[PDB]
Swiss-Prot record, chains A, B:
S-glutathionylation is reversible and dependent on a glutaredoxin. Disulfide bonds: none annotated. This is 3,4-dihydroxy-2-butanone 4-phosphate synthase. The gene is RIB3. The lineage of its organism: Eukaryota, Fungi, Dikarya, Ascomycota, Pezizomycotina. Its cofactor is Mg(2+); Mn(2+). D-ribulose 5-phosphate binds at D31, T75, R133, R134, G135, H136, T137.
């Protein structure tokens, strides 16, 4: 079964990842979604290991303007970034990517805190939220609002790495984690899991 | 020990991944580098599983002009892409990312074959090659030229996922694969491994 939204919010509030399913009519994919403000090096490593590794950062339009993150050019990718910080090295390590996420969420964030282009991909949520666009991007920002966090999330799609093949640089039968698998994945890692659909139902209780 | 360049070229010619080390003075990082033209779904899955998951595609300046891939904004990222193909779905799966790579390398590639923005990150190699810029981007394109392949490679940095933590969404002590580890990683997966430095020495035999 899927977890009830309130419980997903409490977990998100606690700085945990949550597994979020969009509509089968849509991608039919699940993403790991976490608040960016305090994402750790170790959690980032886990995210990278268990996802596509294309680590994105959903944020509001207000943050894209404050931080001077224009659209790269439908997923609203902004220009990519790295943390302008003395501890950053190449920008790709779990350390560096988590740092960038945290910095994007900082109340004191400024445009100069980010090197462009880089290795983290901010995504512009639509003003109307999940009831307006049923995407993981909106879901991330929606969870932030709901949990009282800074308006920046971190998301990544949970791929299915397929099976190991001893001594060969290939994986058999890879794909994307779907439905049932998603819930099982969540249970295995002690995470809450829910659907965007339920998230919307939750938000309509207050917004209609 | 590192493999001799000629042997690395033969492997690359065979459509295998090769492990390439840049300078310690530089990133001190190793990347998986493969020819894009025939990268398979299964190999892509392996690449994703064993790297940062930020799958890039080194290509020449001539290809950036032919394909209308302007700079996103130092790593020369162009605008990102997805394959405009009936089999593409969300653009992130190993299937979809490998397809995009293959399409970027097609002799019949045209700008309209790519949706922008997307999930694969082409990188513009500098005209002068590895002797001009000692980057993995140049190395990828340099291997393509050397092996007689289409002038598009696929690269990704080999991260160190750290250690599993049973039932917890974290990984302990993550980092990047370095030196020794790199060679061991290559042996484990039956891949050749070399340094950019040696690659340059190879190219100077002909170019001075």
């Amino acid at each position: 079964n899927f977890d009830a939204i309130p419980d997903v919010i409490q977990a998100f509030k606690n700085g945990e990842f949550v597994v979020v399913l969009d509509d089968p009519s849509r991608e039919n994919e699940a993403d790991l979604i976490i608040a960016a403000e305090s994402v750790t090096t170790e959690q980032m490593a886990f995210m990278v290991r268990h996802s596509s590794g294309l680590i994105c950062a959903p944020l509001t339009p207000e943050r894209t303007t404050a931080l001077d993150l224009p659209q790269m050019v439908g997923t609203a990718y902004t220009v990519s970034v790295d943390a302008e910080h003395p501890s950053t090295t190449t920008g790709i390590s779990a350390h560096d990517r988590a740092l960038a996420c945290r910095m994007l969420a900082a109340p004191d964030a400024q445009p100069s805190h980010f090197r462009r282009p880089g290795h983290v991909f901010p995504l512009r949520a639509v003003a109307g939220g999940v009831r307006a666009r049923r995407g993981h991007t909106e879901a991330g920002v929606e969870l932030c609002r709901l949990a009282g966090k800074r308006p920046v999330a971190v998301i990544s799609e949970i791929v299915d790495d397929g099976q190991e093949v001893e001594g060969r640089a290939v994986r058999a039968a890879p794909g994307m984690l779907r439905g049932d698998e998603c819930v099982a994945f969540a249970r295995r890692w002690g995470l809450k899991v829910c659907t965007i659909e339920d998230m919307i139902a939750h938000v309509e209780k207050t917004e209609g």
